[PDB]
Design a protein around this ligand. Sequence first.
Ligand SMILES: [NH3+]c1ncnc2c1ncn2[C@@H]1O[C@@H]2CO[P@@](=O)(S)O[C@H]3[C@@H](F)[C@H](n4cnc5c([NH3+])ncnc54)O[C@@H]3COP(=O)(O)O[C@H]2[C@H]1F
Lengths: 183, 181
Amino acid sequence: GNFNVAHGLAWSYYIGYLRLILPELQARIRTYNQHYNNLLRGAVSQRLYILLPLDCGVPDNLSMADPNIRFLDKLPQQTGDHAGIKDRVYSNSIYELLENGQRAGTCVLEYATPLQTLFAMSQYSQAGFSREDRLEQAKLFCRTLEDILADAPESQNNCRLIAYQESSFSLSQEVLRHLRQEE
Amino acid sequence: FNVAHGLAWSYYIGYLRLILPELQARIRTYNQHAVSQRLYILLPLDCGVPDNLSMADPNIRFLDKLPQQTGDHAGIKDRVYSNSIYELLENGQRAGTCVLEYATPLQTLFAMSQYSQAGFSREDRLEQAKLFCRTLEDILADAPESQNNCRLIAYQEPADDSSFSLSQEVLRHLRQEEKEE
Ligand SMILES: [NH3+]c1ncnc2c1ncn2[C@@H]1O[C@@H]2CO[P@@](=O)(S)O[C@H]3[C@@H](F)[C@H](n4cnc5c([NH3+])ncnc54)O[C@@H]3COP(=O)(O)O[C@H]2[C@H]1F
């Protein structure tokens, strides 16, 4: 039930996206740092940071969710032909993480989009899913994605999952704690 | 539920719900600079989805790309949605033009059945392929804003079948469409 739906979305997230952008992600980051970002303490991290809100609350604007998260730039976009669609675009955004009025981190940050589907299926009666099912599917989505990335050859320490519950919550502080943990 | 339910709702929530309300506006922009005003989505039940439509049928040739759609989605700013226009050849000459593409989650279902840690049989793939189409069809039936902007073409045909012409089937749907308008 709740397993098979989140199992398919996690594999969909990996087949259709992560396995395609992760092998060439660190080269895109290194190219951006060497040519467009000569800040000795402001280099873009070498990992794609995927936000996993366990309540599946995914806003369309990541910066307006926290005044300490500021859009900086975009990586060089990656294109390719997929399913008869010529030059399908894959673009990732670089963000500035502020703390105490200072630049504390720079990272490629985005949400796990399939969590929006779990929310919609919990919202629409035709999908026939309840809110408690959505919470269980979100946890099963994260766990399945962990099992895939732990065995995927495209994941060469270039992607970090950030799962969290749910305002006394700072999203930039959530990413900064994971950022500084690897530095 | 099962795998196809999430893939179908994702295809609607994450794609068709976003581009179909703006589809006819982009087609009018393309005419301002003879294509039907509906998105034609192929649903091969065998989940055989080639990245190049011409490899499935050489009579399907790439003509041009629609004006790109752009919007903020999830943490990705200015996510790009692009659609391609194709001409369909009949006896070496153009017989029709339309915005054509496969349903990508069907290709995802195929790749899922090939990965060991996915636990996805070949029989599971065909059943989820049918469940994907029925769920998508039922979703679009309750969303007329999106139903009249698209036409779904589900079909079951092996690659060993020289009796099937993908371009002729799309042309039949195109000609049957204009005959009802
Ligand atoms: N460029 C880019 N950026 C960020 N994230 C991505 C990404 N490409 C993939 N992903 C991630 O991987 C999931 C599965 O991708 P997939 O391809 S296997 O299935 C998709 C596809 F059939 C259709 N669709 C959505 N956008 C589409 C565009 N522009 N053109 C054609 N078809 C599209 O709708 C399904 C669900 O879209 P989703 O956003 O809810 O989930 C996506 C998303 F989370």
